[model samples]
Target chain A: AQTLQMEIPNFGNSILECLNEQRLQGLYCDVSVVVKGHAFKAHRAVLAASSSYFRDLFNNSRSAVVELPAAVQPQSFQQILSFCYTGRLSMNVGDQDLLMYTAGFLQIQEIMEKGTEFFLKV
Target chain B: QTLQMEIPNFGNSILECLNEQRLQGLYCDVSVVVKGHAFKAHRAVLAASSSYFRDLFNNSRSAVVELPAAVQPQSFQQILSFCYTGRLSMNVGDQDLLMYTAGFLQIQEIMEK
Candidate 1:
């Protein structure tokens, strides 16, 4: 049998950069999520692929605008959006609890795992 | 003063390790055949990355897959490289065909790139 070993580079940073730029430009945004009067433009496909909550919501509702509860902070959702697109999240220990809650609600498995790992370490 | 911490790319490291294991024939669980040539790979990686593979391998005990003849071996190699390395090296002429194959495999990241 023939076998080969190869080193693969991580392309996440470049991918994340493009997604971040797209978010900044509001390109291909099909959904508007308003939290505390601040509307965040996002792609419905990306949201659905990342979060089951968003997936179920989109399946049931054809509305382009989604008004989130006030209990979910805009900042947390922004981070979640970033995580959803790029598979990365940055937060301090204090913020992990809330992010964990938000991630649990959104059903982002990776974020929930990260939050759980952080919570245990602290 | 504000501070930000950079997260290291652990996912890439794991992919590289898995690729190494594949090359060594050390714990690979699946075989992909293209035009009679065989390539060894891990099912978990393929299934996790591509919905096509996930659906194909779902609830199946088959260890081998013979790809359609139309799927050129070179293009398949490029797709495999992209799957393992997260990067592709191809000539301008090969780009369209490689993208087509990647899209067919449901490897969204490569298609997007």
Candidate 2:
């Protein structure tokens, strides 16, 4: 029931403080992403928002513990998971091998395209 | 004694792809209008970079967010770049305003950069 036409300077964490004054309501920030029995938090709007159709579980589904394949490395899942939420991609050395392994094993095309374009550019 | 790696900068390629995509205006979720220009960007990047946007966007899922007279369209452009890359470029006095501008927006990361 509000809008975002905010003045940048005047706005602060005071909103959080003021909004706390009306703390009668709550937005549940709990959603568990289960990757080979490991659990991680996936925030809504974003977890739902930017997560492309690359993975099955990333689609608008939530609350709802989701699963990654057994072949997926726990480390790789968490690394790329932030990409879903932040739109920033960081491919770690060594761990990227795991990501490439799992990415191919699971068939997420974007990273695959990354490798594709790299070679094609040569 | 080393084998060849196909994508030495593969991660950079993807990040640049997203940056390029933002310019191409594909997969954009949030439209922010400053002055008369509307910068189309993904909500996650905006919300992730600034704690202010995190809460600012929490409740309202509005497609276009409006910023009043205080924030300049130019500053927000660099702010968006800083959000994506954690890096930015500015001129002499541009730094002063951006320092406070980003600081005002709860984006200390760019301020520090």
Candidate 3:
């Protein structure tokens, strides 16, 4: 992991260095989420970008709906936040297993392949 | 060392009562190496039992490099992969150190909320 020194506003005189960590050597996580008929692919960086895209729908639209195959574990804002910070996930295997199932259901090729690979390994 | 076993995909014939679907994962522990200039706990597993990663035990010890972090020569992926497969496969240069550091730093408060 590479660390970058930056300033954290409320944390006082401390410099908040950003640590950059990727998934493990062989593990990969890739998925696309569809919200209100708009499909957004999953990537650490891209997920951040898309969150902003949905901020408006989340704020004002009661009709906002995201559809995922039954296999996808329903995500709340907290799950996204965990990935954003700490990257320390407390994921239940069942939920992740479902993510793989849902990805396969949607014909999301890359995610399904990677998920299958991980499943086989674990 | 509680091992589990099951036989899935059975047609009701010679043994319908003896077959069933199963979901399971194995767990074990290993001491990890500390790497140089990497994440807080960049580690390499020294040994393991499961056949999936048992071969790694025969590899020679890895060399450590120096980096800028206070806990230079740290390792993490070893612990992670161990938790996953009871063995570690992360090798190469400073990859594990780099990624584990990223995971530790990319902290978002929303996860706890």
Candidate 4:
């Protein structure tokens, strides 16, 4: 198995704080992570551990920062805030890889299951 | 012009990784480059950019090395679209179109079993 090395930038560890919050809050931070096999630069990541997808990003054990890529560009403040406030997405549909990538990164079993169901249906 | 996009980088790398990992017999070329960056774009993202890309994709009949269950002609396009635009536009009652998109975009491997 390939080992992934990660760095949890300042306040990145605080991302764990919102995991169980009823109305989750977004933690915006800069995280630079190297996934051992791959190199990625993501200057800003707005984290909300409400959705099963986002929750997967939080499950990384290597470090506080989750070395995962975005399913979307995360273009606006609204998009980021909506995800944080509620575990719901503004759009009903999204890039499927986003879901799969999130599931694969955090190793979330349930989202992976839902993701597989979505994949098979697609 | 899709300049400054990471798709080319990721695409080339994925092709290389696929070549290194599981594809040994297929003699496909990953020789394309942009701004000296090899495999920058994701293949699916490039495919979603235009019909010209579709033309290239239709000809490369090699089976994907690392794949999801999305093995079809149309599903690739859908998958590529999702990757590029972050939206999955599956029209109800149009399963065939969905498959075509996925296949055209090289994401049929992910969409199917």
Candidate 5:
């Protein structure tokens, strides 16, 4: 049994580091997403595992190419992608409500919930 | 300065489910047979995590990889878990040998702090 194994600690930082680096370098990115005319390369597993919206889409067609409607802003999608990789979303955009909007549309509750708290930074 | 939302344990939520799928045999793309034990994993995850597998899988995408006797199955068991879950578990007496196996596989993440 796995109970015989000793447990160590990490909040999943290193694995995220590795995953994020590969995403940055565009390695093993099996999915291509088009958001407002910008091409975004990503891993299917990360997107599927991170967002239920993506999970449903990938589970549906398991597509290698995805296109987001014109209403979905590319910049906010980029910020949400960053959050998908690092578990941190930068809300510094001058754009209107789209940052949290994209996070919500992506179905990542953590990003949307924490995106609201002004005290989250403190 | 700008506001940035840092979600605690956010990475864990995604990685935990990914590891669960691997454990349940729902999300495995590659397999390794060491000393009669078949360990299942994802090639992308392995390639991202370890230099050995990165180089190995980069060259090819076979369904199974057979390791030499130099790699202990037990040691690989612990390292494989670390590759997916960011958690390494091993016996008290087996730490040194496990580190040796980790080094052999070029897991710099597990070889040190």
Candidate 6:
């Protein structure tokens, strides 16, 4: 059998920290996501890696700002943004449907799964 | 005393799997055809690393992608290496080509560097 072993200690945490730090510092932020007229800055790489929607959009153009439709709540999108930075889901029980819809729109499978799981429990 | 741990070079294994496409024909699910030259790659890794690949694979059912003649096979190979290993090692003379190709690929880390 051909088997391979690989390891990166705290890899997820470290990368998440770096992305959050960059976002907070506004350094190397090439894209801005406008949801409900509130602008949040982030790196295209992070967004692309996290969301297929952003990936396709950024691949087509170098547009710096992406305007999300008015239907998406800025607060829910902010939680999604945090999920992009850190692979963790933090949202109120009441917002599961909105989160699930946004997660579906973004095509983040992990978030979509968690959103579904959260809905199932409540 | 506090505890500390070392991170292994997991990138090396990815590089190995990529090279195996040329050696043993393993784990290569997609073929990128550029200028009549076919390069083997893993669809999952490419999709995970590149938005271009992600969207392309999503929109189409074909496993083979044909690129424009303007894209050099060698440069694409180098960019693919970066997609797997996150490292680029090319001569200064080719930096422009690499940068342009990386930009077209939307590889932010390479374009930023």
- The TM-score each candidate achieves on chain A is 0.76, 0.50, 0.26, 0.27, 0.82, 0.81
CA lDDT scores, all candidates in order: 0.65, 0.55, 0.29, 0.33, 0.75, 0.63
How much of the true contact map at the interface does candidate 6 reproduce, as a fraction? 0.00
Clashing pairs in 5: none
Per model, the share of native interface contacts recovered reads 0.08, 0.01, 0.00, 0.00, 0.44, 0.00
Residues A1-122, candidate 1: write the lDDT tens digits. 12322223455444345435656776435578998999998766456546778878876876879988778888888888877665567676577678778888888765544433332222
Tell me the tens digit of each residue's lDDT in model 5 across A1-122. Answer: 34434333553565666778887887766678998778988876777677888877776774579997777788889988887888777766464377867877888766545344533344
Clashing pairs in 6: none
DockQ, per model, reads 0.08, 0.04, 0.02, 0.01, 0.43, 0.04
Worst 10 residues of 2 chain B by lDDT: B1-10
List, residue by residue over B1-113, the lDDT tens digit for candidate 4.
11111111222222233223212322122222323322323232243333444456446633232223433424443443343333455445666756554554444222423
Give the runs in model 1 whose Cα sits over 4 Å from its true position.
A1-13, A114-116, A119-122, B1-113
Question: TM-score of model 1 relative to the true fold?
Answer: 0.47
Interface CA root-mean-square deviation for model 2: 13.6
Report the number of the highest-DockQ candidate: 5
Report the error of model 2 at residue B20, Å.
1.7
Report the C-alpha displacement of residue B67, candidate 3, in angstroms.
39
- TM-score preference between candidates 1 and 2, better one: 2
In the range B23-71, model 6's lDDT, one tens digit per residue, is 4544355689988888877654565456777577667767688977667
Measured over the true interface residues after superposition, the C-alpha RMSD of each candidate is: 10.5, 13.6, 23.0, 19.9, 3.2, 13.1
| Model 2 chain A: ten consecutive residues of lowest lDDT | A1-10
RMSD of candidates 1 onward, in order: 11.9, 11.6, 20.4, 21.0, 3.6, 12.5
Selected candidate, larger lDDT, 5 vs 6? 5
- Can you tell me which runs of candidate 5 are displaced by over 4 Å? A1-8, A114-122, B26-28, B33-38, B72-74, B91-100
DockQ agreement of candidate 6 with the native complex: 0.04
Report the Cα lDDT for residue A99, model 5.
82
